């Protein structure tokens, strides 16, 4: 077991990324990334409240790996058709009144606590798994996520100054930061690692003073996360040679283009994975805004 108090505010759930030499916090990493603002623009809509009906847990003996899956799929690196045999819904077994199955602290779902293995307090998992069950049904024709439009938001959230994010409007700015030989893909492999879960479980289960307080402290750890992802779906990603360094550039941040064939400087998005990140972004997003 083990309580919380804040959750992500705990020793082992520290998100780092490693850049150049040592591994640093993504808050500091983001501050090492600037914009090019194109003569375009993108207003933000209003994410449609997620379809209530949470998938059907489905019978399946065996703890299934949830954290690894959710993330392998989002900032995957080659996850192919994600919503086939996809278990994400098996994550609805946790959300209930007094179920037994606990969310292992390694990101596995067990049925019944077991001999020497932590697990988030079934008190809060009941609120997280409560909504992300949804993330299960992203392939169901009548529930599929928004998608293309939902990116207006990943973007002003990732970029945009405190000022743009307030009035909705904001040019489609193109990201350049200082690269270092295949940096985006590596930035990403490093992220597939974070114990995302630990974050979300906290994202939706904190009352208020605490929740808003943390939303702010963790916006930095979160943004790095959309960013590794927004690049998955970004026009062209090009590398710019300069004096001595290489200033890597992302052409258009927050403008899902539907790019689907394997690039290299990044992580491709098979169409299914594509609808999924679509689904993931909507729930987590609709939620971030209390």
């Amino acid at each position: 077991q083990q309580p919380t108090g804040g959750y992500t505010t705990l020793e082992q759930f520290a998100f780092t990324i490693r850049n150049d030499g040592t591994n640093a916090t993504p808050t500091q990493f983001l501050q090492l990334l600037s914009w090019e603002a194109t003569e375009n623009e993108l207003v933000k809509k209003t994410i449609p409240t997620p379809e209530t009906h949470l998938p059907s847990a489905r019978n399946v003996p065996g703890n299934v790996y949830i954290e690894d899956a959710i993330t392998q799929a989002l900032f995957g690196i080659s996850a192919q058709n994600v919503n086939a045999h996809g278990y994400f819904s098996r994550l609805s077994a946790l959300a209930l009144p007094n179920t037994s199955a606990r969310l292992g602290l390694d990101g596995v779902i067990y049925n019944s606590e077991t001999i020497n293995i932590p697990f988030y307090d079934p008190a809060a998992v009941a609120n997280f798994a409560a909504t992300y069950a949804k993330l299960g049904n992203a392939s169901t024709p009548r529930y599929r996520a928004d998608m293309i439009d939902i990116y207006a938001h990943v973007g002003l959230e990732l970029a945009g100054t405190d000022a743009e994010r307030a009035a909705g409007v904001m040019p489609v700015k193109r990201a350049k930061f200082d690269s270092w030989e295949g940096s985006l893909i590596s930035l990403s492999r490093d992220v597939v690692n974070w114990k995302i879960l630990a974050f979300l479980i906290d994202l939706c289960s904190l009352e208020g003073e605490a929740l808003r307080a943390f939303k702010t402290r963790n916006r930095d750890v979160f943004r790095m996360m959309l960013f590794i992802m927004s690049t998955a779906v970004a026009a062209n990603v090009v590398n710019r040679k300069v004096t001595k360094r290489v200033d890597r550039v992302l052409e258009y941040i927050g403008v899902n283009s539907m790019r689907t064939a394997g690039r290299t400087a990044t992580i491709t998005y098979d169409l299914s994975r594509h609808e999924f990140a679509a689904k993931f972004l909507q729930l987590t997003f609709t939620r971030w805004n209390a």
Binding site: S56, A57, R58, N59, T140, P141, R142
Partner: peptide, 16 residues
């Protein structure tokens, strides 16, 4: 349910 998915035995033991 409003869908109309097939019906693999895989959910004979489920709640459907």
């Amino acid at each position: 349910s409003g869908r109309n998915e097939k019906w693999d035995q895989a959910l004979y033991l489920s709640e459907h």
